[PDB]
């Protein structure tokens, strides 16, 4: 008859085992090789203001512990109760760019422990992580962001512990996982982030996600409504020059609506000190609207004396402006959209 | 037999019971029958794309090691501290963003065992669950929010989940949602997962949430009508009054833009066209056209000759009937489509 | 007898006491008498539809195993660490959204035992309780917020809750709420629950919260009067001044819409008509009619003939008396109804 | 013959450990008079004073002193001994809680922020660092020239007055960190001390109280509230120097000042709780609104009496502006004299 | 010697080691040498007057009880669970508002011991530290944020802190702050505390944060210029156009007030004059004077006599050159001062 599980666990890692979790596998020999892979269950809360993003993952860690090799059962592997994780050695993996992180204990510890005949261990744990993602917003809202995730050892130096991504499918994403503001690109870069502190040299592996911001929201809520205000400023040119309060009021309100439009769009962003692509658009839209008001300043000023010579001279400005600003604004959009579509 | 001695022999020191070993450990998978009582349902957020729920999660399964003959009682209600001593499933919620137990004034847990070794295990949980939303038809949209009950560590050969046949999901009497109607029919299905670590049991319940329309009539649709109707009073005003007709034309356009942008403030920044965007867009055309109407009236009437003053006067008389007509025709189409 | 030896024999190692067994375990249900002291009452949120409270929860019951004769004292005040050694009820709050104990500087708990085995158990708790609100009469509404004390694991045959006869709910002296008046009368009743797991004891207290009106007079009703009264000054202005009368008519309409929408910002998005919606709607009619009044005046006076200029002049003289009259008549109705 | 003094390990074991027979569940002088606990606090930080939630936050060192005869020692000549704070679990100590506490926490980084010192005669000094959010009911009648009294109640939860009594130190019970400033308030030097002895249906419990006096700084409200209101009132007066024929200009100027004043008034109430009594800022805004609203009614009169273009009425209307030009600046100055003198 | 046996003899059961006793307990104070690695630096809030940091805190000291000769290794890297078995300093952060350890996936701690008994102890911490700010020169202000490392329980005769001589504070490569520049030079000093409980070791590091100006040029200073320049176009407009010049004068004043008040929204309510208040105040004078300029032009030109119409015309011609000049002179002064 085969050995009872209770007796087996006691002899392998319990009281009678002589197993010490404070000693690493191959303790006098070469470093432990931990093979990592992650399953991304959820990806979101991508905040420009706080410059971070949230992720829910299953972190898988694989390594060999010869002390856990067994011959008592024919099974290729054994699925163990996760309470046995406290009894075995395991890597001290932490996330270097983590701002917040927690385990999941409902309804029980969200953990998995599997051991193989030859002493291989599979250790999966569910984690929620808030990771820092420094952003370059120069091309906002046509920007593309690279958010990273660093898996590092806190206490073991490179001679004792080394991390490594799986060869096949290191990062997996849940089927049908969508982000409302971004597109998560299929290609994820993998690299080493090996750290050198004054305490020594520590293993660190990295994955980089590429996030492309979706443009459609900004067309509807930012670019189209700015067009509306610029087009509105042009109706001044089809209005009678004698109607001063109407043309001025129409010129002012477009300028002020454009400033609140511009400042309101910057409300959901961090206070960076470089020029963004949306700042260029709003600046130029503000010129075209501001020029339409200066256009009437000229029309009102040259037409002071009611002599036909000046009334017609002022009339000439409106006829030119009626064609030139719509032309000049179209020329600007050609340049603008080509620059941020080509580059 | 004294309860103290009984508990010791069944699951305590003298029992030889090992909670690290599942029931029927060398045999077929443990069949866990689940049912939930929804105590509270709310915090349905479009922005963060999730909802909050307070539930009693009931789990039923058979553990032959816990069968008893010492008492005639069909079942025994045990102190929940004994839950630490017995095996139980590792149920987690796959789409959970936040979750907690309830420990006031004591652990909000229930443990009941039956003669034949059946276990009833109820626990009170608060869960924040993710609910991806399709807002194409907002605010006449209907949302499907799910809840996945999954095993983290046991594969399908060791552990299987299953909904109760009779009344798997129960809702507290008189439970109302201020923004939504929770439909009576809940879909039940399997979400069985296949990871690189293996095949894991997963069962799913889908709630159907129908957004209540009344709020948006009062705070969104009626006040937009008011601005469109306001733009039409321009057509009954004297054409000579340029500042009045222009100012009235502008303010309606700007009030309409702030109205439109303000309605999008409580929503996530999605990149598709919503039903409210169509309404505001068209309302903006009718108000913007009313201003362009005066641009025409002011332009054709430049020279004070009677021929043009009457020609300009003709535009207002047509516009007075045509925009109210055209706007009514639009509402017929709009409300019929959705 | 030394206290150390006494505690050891009553509930410790040598006692044979088992906290997993209830008092009168083979007999009738344990009668727990509850009373609460409300230390703090506030954070009453309409949006999230809940309120926060800080209380001392007192529980009284008899455990014959804790009867003593070793000391003449009527009762003994025990160190609260002994609460872990005795049986106690599993009271939870059914409508609790959040709850916590208080551990600074030590556990905020009290344990007192009496000669005959009676136990007094007081614990300080902060609770966030759900309070579904009816805002039909807002801001002249009155709200009923409840608090349910329930057993999670014991059925009615094993455990029954009951309010004290004398002063079950006590309130700290000078406790005031800035937005509400907490009425002196609190309703007490049974909320006995029937789940598929059985029948569970539940007792309930209902607080009546009357919203204070003064804030809304100053920040909502008076400023709306100001805008309505402002619209009437148009009628004392020259009819030739089109831009002035129109601009004055528009700005009052738009100020009234932002006034109306801004007042709904601190409320949940409910789909029924509130009393404040009626007021703002009617105020909007009187302001909107004042603008339509000038549309008529400007339209009938097109040709500068004396017959129409006087006919248009007649409208203003009637309107000067009729709208102030009609608005006063509306307030008579409105304030009398609510 | 001078033998070696007792080892600390053995000493702690005999005083409060295994061999001691010490029971932390029994109070000092258990069959005798009440334990006299002498309290004092050091205020490390004082802030987050919120009108809306009606509370304030404080970081303190809470010192408690009392005598436990069981902890008297003669084995060392030292007047006192500084003990590892893990020994706090082994001794009896008071059950002090803060009666008006809405939130409270200990500090465990990098170790427990606690101090335990014992004296030859059995006196104990126990200091613990706490962050507390305390409720402070506010009277805003005189806001923003209001003065607030925020209290802090130290109470026993489980011990009645016959077993436990609290008492402030005679010398310097409340100490404040040097250079501690509050941006919105001035913390007055004088702190009131008194008894808050509680009588519940569970009995009579010791309670001692400290009252802080917080005087709100006026400078912020001059710059952001009072001066900008003056600007709008002064702006309304420029109407009186404008031509009476210019109806749209005088009306538009009259309206915009009224509406700017309402948004000014409602915006100032945004950071306050929704109280149902009249505040001092409500009086100011109300009167400022009268002066601006009267300036518009002034033109209603000017426009109405001057209907027919006859010289008699045009001059009669002209007389109103000349009186108003001097009377409103006078009347507004008279109001400020009254207003600022009252508060 | 096996590691298990070695740890048992050095600090475990057979060791006789007592973590409640400090190294050199009857002798001179323990000298703890501190150094920090700044992994992250941010959340610098003016409103709450604090900042957040993520660090590795390194502590070095000698414990002769931990000296070893059993292995030739210069040092040994120990499992961090052994930290509970050894004595270590009670370092706390005096100006800490919030602080936490990091336990994912295991305790983020490092323990290394040397032959001679030296200990290296590194722990990862997130800290929210208070940073009182002087905003007199905002937004051209420079801030000094400090970090105090103090002993809570040990007086100066038992425990002394000290910064490392070489590289006490290290910063992660490529660490940038979006609003500030973290200066390379960090001041180090002693903050030794004297309470009524005694004299306690305290060492301090001061970071110098220079606020980046570019954001405020784009979102604050340039848009204010735009409104001031807009006010000047009034001077090229016909004096007969009263509603146009007044409306243009008003809207610039009101846009400037909302501009000014909106810039103060992200700041604490301090009662001293800031540099941005001076700028907005002066910008408000130039815009307010442009409106008073027309009050003069409209008033002196009452009677249509050529003498006054030209006299009023003279004011505009002077104002057209003088305000652009005077505003340029102001900017020369302003930007040179700060
Ligand atoms: C000269 C200003 C007057 C008032 C003109 O303003 C207007 C029209 C009327 C006037 C003629 C409108 C104005 C923009 C200007 C034109 C300006 C630009 C096209 C850009 O800026 C210029 C000058 C600027 O150096 C001050 C310079 O950046 C420097 C410093 C930078 O460090 C961060 C550095 O990276 C760089 C290398 O070098 C830049 C390259 O080039 C453009 C960047 C300005 C955008 C401004 C805005 C966008 O939204 C802002 C806000 O939400 C609002 C309410 C109004 C906008 C506005 O006010 O827009 C706003 O502030 O035209
Ligand atoms: C008809 C609208 C035109 C544009 C008129 O608008 C104005 C004046 C000009 C036009 C003549 C102004 C308008 C109110 C209307 C008159 C309307 C009422 C007195 C009330 O509503 C009516 C119709 C309503 O049914 C559409 C009906 O509800 C029932 C049936 C519904 O099912 C069909 C059902 O769901 C619901 C639960 O029970 C009701 C009993 O009775 C009143 C309730 C409307 C209030 C509206 C408002 C209050 O604040 C809102 C907002 O903050 C804002 C910015 C402006 C307001 C406004 O716009 O106020 C506002 O939106 O007059
Ligand atoms: C007299 C005001 C009239 C209405 C003038 O207002 C205007 C133009 C029109 C009028 C002529 C506009 C006004 C500024 C003033 C001129 C004022 C200054 C240049 C400064 O202030 C003066 C007086 C001030 O003492 C009241 C004094 O502070 C000292 C002494 C105080 O002890 C008496 C003491 O407590 C204090 C701590 O230190 C100071 C040194 O000097 C300047 C500081 C004022 C700035 C004001 C503002 C900036 O943004 C604010 C707000 O976001 C807004 C909406 C409008 C602004 C405004 O309203 O700006 C605003 O409120 O001109
Ligand atoms: C065996 C451990 C550790 C130890 O406790 N001792 C006594 C020795 C003895 C001889 N040589 C090395 C050690 C150290 C290192 N090994 S270990 O490689 O298994 C180990 C164990 C735990 C660790 C660690 C390294 O880095 C930080 O956490
Ligand atoms: C008996 C357990 C587990 C174990 O510890 N041992 C020693 C053996 C021995 C032989 N065959 C299988 C095992 C595994 C599996 N069984 S179990 O089915 O009861 C079990 C128990 C706990 C588990 C688990 C599976 O997966 C998740 O956590
Ligand atoms: C004695 C307990 C409980 C138990 O553990 N056993 C062994 C028996 C034995 C015989 N009859 C009943 C029991 C049950 C019931 N009793 S109890 O009434 O004291 C009890 C104890 C704990 C409970 C509970 C009821 O409801 C839920 O939590
Ligand atoms: C000695 C304790 C407590 C106790 O456990 N016993 C057995 C007795 C015996 C005789 N008289 C009184 C007691 C009580 C009271 N004393 S005590 O004064 O030290 C005490 C100890 C702990 C307490 C308490 C009072 O009230 C709050 O919690
Ligand atoms: C040895 C400890 C402590 C102690 O427990 N005893 C018995 C004595 C005996 C004689 N002299 C001093 C003591 C005190 C002080 N020492 S200690 O320096 O190692 C120490 C240990 C722990 C401490 C502490 C001081 O202050 C803060 O917490
Ligand atoms: C602590 O050690 C440093 C060198 O590591 C030394 O310079 C300093 O003097 C020591 N401090 C004391 C108080 O002895
Ligand atoms: Cl206007
Ligand atoms: Zn790539
Ligand atoms: Zn369905
Ligand atoms: Zn009642
Ligand atoms: Zn005082
Ligand atoms: Zn320096």
Residues β-bridged to residue E50 = E45, E130
d(CA A55, CA A179): 12
d(CA C62, CA C23): 7
Decide which of C212, C227, C243 is a domain's last residue.
C212
**Chain A interface mutation, best of B23, B243, B249, highest count of A Cβ atoms under 10 Å:** B243
Return the residue matching tokens 């501009």.
E259
Could you say which ligand is closest to the alpha carbon of residue C251? 10
Q: A273 to chain B, minimum CA–CA distance in Å?
A: 24
B165 in the same domain as B71: yes
Return the residue matching tokens 């319990």.
A14
The conformation of residue E152, written as its DSSP 8-state character, comes to S
Report which secondary-structure segment, H or E, holds A253.
helix A244-265
**First-to-last C-alpha distance (Å) of chain D:** 79
Least CB-CB distance to D223: which of E130, E277, E302?
E277
Decide which of E212, E234, E252 is a domain's last residue.
E212
Provide the 10 A C-beta neighbour count for residue E178.
19
Listing DSSP states for B17-36 in one string gives --TTS-TTTTSSPEEEEEEE
C191 in the same domain as C316: no
CB proximity list for D204: less than 8 A, separation 6 or greater? D160, D161, D197, D198
Q: Which residue from A39, A74, A42, A76 is spatially nearest to A58, judged by alpha carbons? A: A39
Q: A340 to chain E, minimum CA–CA distance in Å?
A: 21
Give per-residue burial for C236-247: e unless 16+ CB within 10 Å, then b. Answer: ebebebbbbbbb
The answer to whether the bond into A107 is cis (omega within 30° of 0) is yes
Tell me the resolution in Å. 2.8
D226 in the same domain as D188: no
Residue length of chain D: 343
**Chain A interface mutation, best of B258, B269, B292, highest count of A Cβ atoms under 10 Å:** B269
E42 in the same domain as E181: yes
Distance B189 CA to ligand 12 centre (A): 11
Which experimental approach was used here? X-ray
d(CA D13, CA D11): 5
d(CA B149, CA B95): 9
Cα–Cα distances (Å) from B248 to A186, A228, C292, E6, E252, in that order, read 52, 17, 13, 90, 20
d(CA E162, CA E146): 16
Q: Which residue from A198, A200, A196, A154 is spatially nearest to E165, judged by alpha carbons? A: A198
Cα–Cα distances (Å) from D124 to A220, D24, D116, in that order, read 70, 14, 7
Question: Parallel, antiparallel, or unpaired for β C109-114 and C75-78?
Answer: antiparallel
Q: Please work out whether the CB of residue E257 comes within 6 Å of at least one atom of ligand 3.
A: yes
Q: Which residue from D278, A160, E82, B285 is spatially nearest to C222, judged by alpha carbons? A: D278
d(CA E186, CA E182): 9
Classified as helix, coil or strand, B277 is: helix
**Positions at the binding site of D:** 190, 192, 200-205, 213
In the numeric block, which tokens belong to residue C314?
Answer: 């007649």
Return the residue matching tokens 């002088």.
D29
Please, what is the Cα angle at E59 between E55 and E63, to 5 degrees? 160
For a substitution probing ligand 8, which of D81, D115, D118, D127 has the most ligand atoms within 8 Å of its CB?
A: D81
A220 in the same domain as A118: no
Write out chain E residues lying below 8 Å of D252, CB-based. 243, 246-247, 250
d(CA B161, CA B154): 11
Q: Which residue from E225, B291, B226, B239 is spatially nearest to A229, judged by alpha carbons? A: B291
Distance D83 CA to ligand 8 centre (A): 5
CB proximity list for E123: less than 8 A, separation 6 or greater? D110, E56, E57, E101, E108, E109, E110
d(CA E234, CA D43): 58
Q: Which residue from D198, D214, D218, D215 is spatially nearest to D206, judged by alpha carbons? A: D198
The answer to whether the bond into C31 is cis (omega within 30° of 0) is no
Q: What are phi and psi of C283, to 5 degrees?
A: -55, -35
Distance E69 CA to ligand 8 centre (A): 28
In the numeric block, which tokens belong to residue E155?
Answer: 């007086």
d(CA C123, CA C112): 12
Q: What is chain C's alpha carbon radius of gyration, rounded to the nearest angstrom?
A: 32
> What is the position in ligand 4's atom list of the atom closest to the CA of A20?
1
In the numeric block, which tokens belong to residue C329?
Answer: 């008549």
> What is the position in ligand 1's atom list of the atom closest to the CA of E214?
33
Write out chain C residues lying below 8 Å of B3, CB-based. 18, 20-21, 25
E126 in the same domain as E6: yes
Q: What are phi and psi of A169, to 5 degrees?
A: 50, 65
Q: Is C199 annotated as a binding residue?
A: yes
Nearest CA to ligand 8 atom 2: E21
B178 in the same domain as B233: no
Return the residue matching tokens 């334990």.
D35
**H helices, E strands: number in chain C:** 6, 15
Q: Cite the beta strand spans of A48-192 per DSSP E.
A: 52-64, 77-80, 93-95, 98-102, 111-116, 120-132, 144-153, 161-165, 171-173, 182-184, 189-192
Q: Cite the beta strand spans of B196-272 per DSSP E.
A: 198-200, 202-211
* E123 contacts E57 by C-beta, under 8 angstroms: yes
**Positions at the binding site of E for strychnine:** 195-200
d(CA C178, CA D310): 59
Could you say which ligand is closest to the alpha carbon of residue C136? 2
Classified as helix, coil or strand, C111 is: strand
Side-chain-side CA neighbours of B102 within 13 Å: the count stands at 28
* E196 contacts D175 by C-beta, under 8 angstroms: yes
**Chain D interface mutation, best of E49, E58, E92, E247, highest count of D Cβ atoms under 10 Å:** E92
Residues β-bridged to residue E169 = E36
B305 in the same domain as B252: yes
A172 in the same domain as A44: yes
Residues β-bridged to residue C114 = C75
Side-chain-side CA neighbours of B187 within 13 Å: the count stands at 12
How many beta-carbon contacts under 8 Å exist across B and C? Answer: 150
Cα–Cα distances (Å) from C243 to B299, C23, D309, E302, in that order, read 19, 86, 20, 22
Cα–Cα distances (Å) from D289 to C221, C235, D231, in that order, read 16, 21, 12
Flag if C218 and D282 touch (Cβ within 8 Å): yes
Q: What is chain E's alpha carbon radius of gyration, rounded to the nearest angstrom?
A: 32
Could you say which ligand is closest to the alpha carbon of residue D26? 7
Question: Parallel, antiparallel, or unpaired for β D35-50 and D174-176?
Answer: parallel
Write out chain A residues lying below 8 Å of B57, CB-based. 107
* D38 contacts D64 by C-beta, under 8 angstroms: yes
Cα E228 off chain centre by = 33
Cα–Cα distances (Å) from E338 to A321, B11, E128, E228, E324, in that order, read 42, 78, 31, 21, 21
> What is the position in ligand 9's atom list of the atom closest to the CA of E160?
13
In the numeric block, which tokens belong to residue B177?
Answer: 């949602």
* Number of domains within chain C: 2
Q: Please work out whether the CB of residue E152 comes within 6 Å of at least one atom of ligand 8.
A: no
Give per-residue burial for B57-84: e unless 16+ CB within 10 Å, then b. Answer: bbbbbbbebbebeeeeeebbbbbbeebe
Q: Which residue from A200, A172, A204, A198 is spatially nearest to A186, judged by alpha carbons? A: A172
Give per-residue burial for B89-114: e unless 16+ CB within 10 Å, then b. Answer: bbbbbbbbbebeebebbbbbbbbbbb
* C172 contacts D200 by C-beta, under 8 angstroms: no
HEC secondary structure over chain D:
CCCCCCCHHHHHHHHCCHHHCCCCCCCCCCCCCCEEEEEEEEEEEEEEEECCCCEEEEEEEEEEEEECHHHCCCCCCCCEEEECHHHHHHCCCCCEEECCEEEEECCCCCCCCEEEEEECCCEEEEEEEEEEEEECCCCCCCCCCCEEEEEEEEEECCCCCCCEEEEECCCCCEEECCCCCCCCEEECCCCEEEECCEEECCEEECEEEEEEEEEECCHHHHHHHHHHHHHHHHHHHHHHHCCCCCHHHHHHHHHHHHHHHHHHHHHHCCCCCCCCCCCHHHHHHHHHHHHHHHHHHHHHHHHHHCCCCCHHHHHHHHHHHHHHHHHHHHHHHHHHHHHHHHC
Q: Which residue from B90, B34, B87, B81 is spatially nearest to B65, judged by alpha carbons? A: B87
In the numeric block, which tokens belong to residue C203?
Answer: 């007792």
CB proximity list for B322: less than 8 A, separation 6 or greater? none
Q: D3 to chain C, minimum CA–CA distance in Å?
A: 36
D265 in the same domain as D134: no
Q: Please work out whether the CB of residue E79 comes within 6 Å of at least one atom of ligand 4.
A: yes
Could you say which ligand is closest to the alpha carbon of residue E151? 8
The conformation of residue C29, written as its DSSP 8-state character, comes to P
Q: Please work out whether the CB of residue A7 comes within 6 Å of at least one atom of ligand 5.
A: no
Distance E174 CA to ligand 11 centre (A): 21
Flag if A181 and B271 touch (Cβ within 8 Å): yes
CATH code of E131's domain:
2.70.170.10
E228 in the same domain as E168: no
Could you say which ligand is closest to the alpha carbon of residue C21? 6
Domain that holds residue A330: 215-343
* A153 contacts A204 by C-beta, under 8 angstroms: yes
d(CA D25, CA C3): 9
Classified as helix, coil or strand, A28 is: coil
Listing DSSP states for E319-335 in one string gives HHHHHHHHHHHHHHHHH
d(CA E126, CA E55): 6
Decide which of C179, C212, C245 is a domain's last residue.
C212
In the numeric block, which tokens belong to residue D229?
Answer: 């209101």
Q: What is chain B's alpha carbon radius of gyration, rounded to the nearest angstrom?
A: 32
Distance A97 CA to ligand 11 centre (A): 19
Listing DSSP states for E100-115 in one string gives E---SSS--EEEEEET
For a substitution probing ligand 2, which of C273, C281, C291, C333 has the most ligand atoms within 8 Å of its CB?
A: C281
Nearest CA to ligand 1 atom 34: A274
Cα E330 off chain centre by = 30
Residues β-bridged to residue E34 = E59, E163
What residues are in contact with ligand 2 under a 6 Å CB criterion?
B 214, 217-219, 222-223, 225-226, 229; C 257, 260-261, 264, 272-273, 277, 280-281, 284-285, 288
Q: Please work out whether the CB of residue D32 comes within 6 Å of at least one atom of ligand 3.
A: no
Closest residue in D to E251 (Cα) is D256
E229 in the same domain as E164: no
* B134 contacts B144 by C-beta, under 8 angstroms: no
Q: Please work out whether the CB of residue D83 comes within 6 Å of at least one atom of ligand 8.
A: yes
Report which secondary-structure segment, H or E, holds B77.
strand B75-78
Alpha-carbon torsion angle D277, D281, D286, D289, nearest 10: -150
Q: A62 to chain B, minimum CA–CA distance in Å?
A: 11
d(CA C11, CA C15): 5
Please, what is the Cα angle at C223 between C220 and C225, to 5 degrees? 105
> What is the position in ligand 3's atom list of the atom closest to the CA of D219?
35
Q: Is A198 annotated as a binding residue?
A: yes
**Positions at the binding site of E for Zn(2+):** 185, 187, 208
In the numeric block, which tokens belong to residue A251?
Answer: 């010129």
Report which secondary-structure segment, H or E, holds A22.
none
CATH code of B296's domain:
1.20.58.390
Give per-residue burial for B221-248: e unless 16+ CB within 10 Å, then b. Answer: bebbebbbbbbbbbbebebebbbbbbbb
Burial class (CB in 10 A: 0-12, 13-18, 19+), D61: buried
**CA dihedral sign, ordered E77, E79, E82, E83:** positive
Q: What is chain A's alpha carbon radius of gyration, rounded to the nearest angstrom?
A: 32
**First-to-last C-alpha distance (Å) of chain B:** 69
Report which secondary-structure segment, H or E, holds E195.
strand E193-195
**CA dihedral sign, ordered E278, E279, E283, E284:** negative
What residues are in contact with ligand 9 under a 6 Å CB criterion?
E 31, 33, 160, 162
Q: Is C195 annotated as a binding residue?
A: yes
């Amino acid at each position: 008859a085969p050995m009872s599980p209770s007796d087996f666990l006691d002899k392998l890692m319990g009281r009678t085992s002589g197993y010490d979790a404070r000693i690493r596998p191959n303790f006098k020999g070469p470093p432990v090789n931990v093979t990592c892979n992650i399953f991304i269950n959820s990806f979101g809360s991508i905040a420009e203001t706080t410059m971070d993003y949230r992720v829910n993952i299953f972190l898988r860690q694989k390594w060999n512990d010869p002390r856990l090799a067994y011959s008592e059962y024919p099974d290729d592997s054994l699925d163990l109760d996760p309470s046995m994780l406290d009894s075995i050695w395991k890597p001290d993996l932490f996330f270097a760019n983590e701002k917040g992180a927690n385990f999941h204990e409902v309804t029980t510890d969200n953990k998995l422990l599997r051991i193989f005949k030859n002493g291989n261990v599979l250790y999966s744990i569910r984690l929620t992580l808030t990771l820092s993602c420094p952003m370059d917003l120069k091309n906002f809202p046509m920007d593309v962001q690279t958010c990273i995730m660093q898996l590092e050892s806190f206490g073991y130096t490179m001679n004792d512990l080394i991390f490594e991504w799986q060869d096949e499918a290191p990062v997996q994403v849940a089927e049908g996982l969508t982000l409302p503001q971004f597109l998560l690109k299929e290609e994820k870069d993998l690299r080493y982030c090996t750290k050198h502190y004054n305490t020594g040299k520590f293993t660190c592996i990295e994955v980089r996600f590429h996030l492309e911001r979706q443009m459609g929201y900004y067309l509807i809520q930012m670019y189209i409504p700015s067009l509306l205000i610029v087009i509105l400023s042009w109706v001044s040119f089809w209005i009678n020059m004698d109607a001063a309060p109407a043309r001025v009021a129409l010129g002012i309100t477009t300028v002020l609506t454009m400033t609140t439009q511009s400042s309101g769009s910057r409300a959901s962003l961090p206070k960076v000190s470089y020029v963004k692509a949306i700042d260029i658009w709003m600046a130029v839209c503000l010129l075209f609207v501001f020029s339409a008001l200066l256009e009437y300043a000229a029309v009102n000023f040259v037409s002071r004396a009611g002599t036909k010579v000046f009334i017609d001279r002022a009339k000439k400005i409106d006829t030119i402006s009626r064609a030139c600003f719509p032309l000049a604004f179209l020329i600007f959009n050609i340049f603008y959209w080509v620059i941020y579509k080509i580059l």
